[PDB]
Design a protein around this ligand. Structure first.
Ligand SMILES: CC(C)(O)C(=O)Nc1ccc([N+](=O)[O-])c(C(F)(F)F)c1
Lengths: 249, 8
């Protein structure tokens, strides 16, 4: 009966790996070259995952592309937290298997505060008793959670489609939690969780772009496609031309 | 772009 939820699980990506020299003593330059590799791989995986989404083929192929490029980091950060939650129970950061982040790597990467934030969201998963089905469904909602204020090439469709993903999230909660101030209690937190992802993303958007600019001066390598997105679409978000849709203000 | 042309 869970037609929507079959799909989401059915289309779930594999455990992507970075290919990081775990035998080499840590260094900013080494660390961030694997995280850029990681980004670039996961991006591909996001692309294929996203195209299978129910009603995604509905969007105009530019919107299809745009929502991917805009929402791409937040998705990486969401799933990531679930990975560190379910693999390392939230003690470290399960980026990929070959790239798990301890405290000293967190600091050595120069994204410490930013990771502080992400280990929190990892902790949120447990604290809030997030279900696997609750995760997947929140995860899907996130591709539809960041519009350009400029206007999408076909907004109407996007809006219909988004409004539906919320129904589906409702339905996942309203299922086994039969009660008024329960479904209500839950949704709040979940939307309150989903919103909290955005600040993390924009921070990583700032670090990335920054690193990208000063990359000539650090020995850190941006994949052909990493670096186009970070230059072409990220500055849109950072310049405020693209904003996240928030549940609360 | 590089994304748009890998995408389609
Ligand atoms: C491209 C930038 C600097 O490397 C980056 O933040 N990469 C990156 C790669 C993978 C993952 N991941 O979810 O496993 C993440 C992050 F979502 F955790 F932040 C970032």
């Amino acid at each position: 009966q869970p037609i929507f939820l079959n799909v989401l699980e059915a289309i779930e990506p594999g455990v992507v790996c970075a290919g990081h020299d775990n035998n080499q003593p840590d260094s900013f330059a080494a660390l961030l070259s694997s995280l850029n590799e990681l980004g670039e791989r996961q991006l591909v995986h996001v692309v294929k995952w996203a195209k299978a989404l129910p009603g995604f083929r509905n969007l105009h192929v530019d919107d299809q592309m745009a929502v991917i490029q805009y929402s791409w980091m937040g998705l990486m950060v969401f799933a990531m937290g679930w990975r560190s939650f379910t693999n390392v129970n939230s003690a470290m950061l399960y980026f990929a298997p070959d790239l798990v982040f301890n405290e000293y790597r967190m600091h050595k990467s120069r994204m410490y505060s930013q990771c502080v934030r992400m280990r929190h969201l990892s902790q949120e998963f447990g604290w809030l008793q997030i279900t696997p089905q609750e995760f997947l469904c929140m995860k899907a909602l996130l591709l539809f959670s960041i519009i350009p204020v400029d206007g999408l090439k076909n907004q109407k469709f996007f809006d219909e489609l988004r409004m539906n993903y919320i129904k589906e999230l409702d339905r996942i909660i309203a299922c086994k939690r039969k009660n008024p101030t329960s479904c209500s209690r839950r949704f709040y937190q979940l939307t309150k969780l989903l919103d909290s992802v955005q600040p993390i993303a924009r921070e990583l958007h700032q670090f990335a772009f920054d690193l990208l600019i000063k990359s000539h001066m650090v020995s850190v390598d941006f994949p052909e496609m990493m670096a186009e997105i970070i230059s072409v679409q990220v500055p849109k978000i950072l310049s405020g031309k693209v904003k996240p849709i928030y549940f609360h203000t | 772009s590089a994304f748009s042309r890998y995408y389609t």
